[PDB]
Amino acid sequence: PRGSHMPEETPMEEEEVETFAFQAEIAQLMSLIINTFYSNKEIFLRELISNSSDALDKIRYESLTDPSKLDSGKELHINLIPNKQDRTLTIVDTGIGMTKADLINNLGTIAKSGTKAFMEALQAGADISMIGQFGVGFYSAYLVAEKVTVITKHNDDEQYAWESSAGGSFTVRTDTGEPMGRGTKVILHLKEDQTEYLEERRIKEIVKKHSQFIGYPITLFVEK
Ligand SMILES: Nc1ncnc2c1ncn2[C@@H]1O[C@H](COP(=O)(O)CP(=O)(O)OP(=O)(O)O)[C@@H](O)[C@H]1O
Numbered sequence: 001p002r003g004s005h006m007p008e009e010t011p012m013e014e015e016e017v018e019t020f021a022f023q024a025e026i027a028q029l030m031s032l033i034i035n036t037f038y039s040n041k042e043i044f045l046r047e048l049i050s051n052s053s054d055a056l057d058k059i060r061y062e063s064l065t066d067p068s069k070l071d072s073g074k075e076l077h078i079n080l081i082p083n084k085q086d087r088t089l090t091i092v093d094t095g096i097g098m099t100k101a102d103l104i105n106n107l108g109t110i111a112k113s114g115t116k117a118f119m120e121a122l123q124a125g126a127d128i129s130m131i132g133q134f135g136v137g138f139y140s141a142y143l144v145a146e147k148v149t150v151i152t153k154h155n156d157d158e159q160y161a162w163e164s165s166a167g168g169s170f171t172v173r174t175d176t177g178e179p180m181g182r183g184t185k186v187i188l189h190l191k192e193d194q195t196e197y198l199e200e201r202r203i204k205e206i207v208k209k210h211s212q213f214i215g216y217p218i219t220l221f222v223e224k
């Protein structure tokens, strides 16, 4: 016989993980990117927004051939979410997303034919901006980020998280966070001295400077 139970008186989820070694020259690039000073680091955002733009082109075309592909969401766009509390900058798109095998192949495991050429150009003093011509622009994220997590959902697979703090390895895991529906979320965990990339004025400045010709709307979400 009880009139009142207190809160302290009232199941284990199981996530599968896989750990991968970066391709040798990818790992060398990452070290070079992380451990060398570059001015002009702001170009990281151009590279990530170009990737979103490419993934949005892909879904726009796939869906011409099959309206069914936009069942996972019709709106084609990019959102930028700085968070000063946890020091993350999140780039979200509703492009094609990546399958599990896409993450494993495209972000780290397969050799890229421009990496050796990029590393020589950089050691000769090329601006890191040149990274966009060498097919390795994703890694520019590590100019400003100590860790990068990629959350992604493709129509043909489940939701996956890829994550890396560099140092030769990344992980891919099944993700049961907030469901995405379709697209990719790049979550940059900013290095302590790179917090300017959480300011609304700086974000507007660099989109205006470098991402003026993007054929999808970009919205900035600013916490009050
Ligand atoms: N937002 C995103 N959505 C979907 N896939 C993405 C993505 N960001 C990155 N990727 C995947 O990661 C791959 C590698 O990206 P990058 O390092 O920028 C070279 P790229 O953009 O493919 O080269 P390119 O500029 O020569 O065309 C892309 O090709 C894509 O498969």
Ligand SMILES: [Mg+2]
Pocket (backbone or CB within 6 Å): 047, 050, 051, 137, 138
């Ligand atoms: Mg790219």
